[PDB]
Design a protein around this ligand. Structure first.
Ligand SMILES: [Cl-]
Ligand SMILES: [Cl-]
Length: 254
């Protein structure tokens, strides 16, 4: 995996790896968070805080010592840091060795929440996905299906119950677009869309609570670039089977 999920902890030799295999970010047993190139050359570090330490992804990436104090932080410069951002923000380590923290607000959803859902897990449907009748996703006790008949439906599985549906009868594809919109088409006729065309690539979140949301990447900070006041345009990255977050790549500068 090249990424860290909200609230994930790494410690005692656990690491992530860039998609090309060249860069490794490892939270060592001696308490140093170190970025390696080619498995042999350290190119950046926190410097060690000793045994018993860990790194956690919690809006910021924070290194904790054994006493439970924060000893190093990304220190993302932010107007507001609410507690639920800690449940949303994720990190990517990309192919030039930079690593970046994203925190993305729901642009559209199948339901309007009265408060954040605690401990929810999202199955990510990435940019460029083209759903075709017969496509399905399973997260927990819920199933997202783009059906033979063109309907996009969320079912509770056991027992089987319709939770939400588009009623896009006849449709033949549903496309998570580069422009930020999610659109259900018969041929090239648009039958339904999320109204989220902004020019920033879309992805969807399908939850293990039977909900679907669309979000767009919002890069706030990188190790090499610092804090960014406006989010640059990124492009979909190469995910592998252990990645559970969106994966992106970003250019070296403007
Ligand atoms: Cl360094
Ligand atoms: Cl996860």
């Amino acid at each position: 995996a090249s990424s860290l999920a909200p609230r994930q902890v790494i410690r005692d030799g656990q690491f992530i790896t860039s998609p090309n295999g060249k860069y490794k970010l490892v939270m060592q047993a001696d308490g140093n968070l170190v970025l390696y190139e080619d498995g042999t050359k350290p190119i950046w570090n926190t410097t060690p805080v000793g045994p018993g330490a860990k790194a956690v992804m919690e809006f910021n990436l924070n290194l904790y010592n054994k006493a439970g104090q924060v000893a190093w932080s990304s220190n993302v410069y932010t107007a507001y840091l609410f507690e639920e951002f800690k449940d949303e923000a994720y990190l990517n380590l990309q192919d030039d060795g930079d690593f970046g923290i994203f925190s993305d607000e729901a642009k559209w959803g199948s339901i309007v929440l009265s408060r954040p859902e605690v401990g929810v897990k999202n199955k990510i449907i990435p940019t460029g996905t083209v759903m075709v009748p017969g496509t399905e996703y399973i997260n927990g006790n819920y199933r997202l299906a783009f059906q033979g008949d063109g309907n996009l439906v969320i079912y509770q599985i056991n027992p089987q119950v319709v939770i939400w549906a588009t009623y896009t009868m006849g449709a033949d594809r549903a496309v998570v677009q580069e422009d930020g919109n999610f659109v259900i088409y018969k041929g090239t006729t648009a039958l339904w869309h999320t109204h989220t065309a902004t020019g920033m690539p879309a992805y969807l979140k399908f939850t293990n609570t039977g909900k679907l949301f669309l979000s767009q990447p919002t890069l706030l900070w990188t190790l090499k670039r610092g804090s960014l006041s406006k989010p640059p345009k990124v492009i979909p990255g190469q995910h592998g089977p252990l990645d559970t977050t969106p994966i992106w790549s970003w250019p070296h500068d403007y």
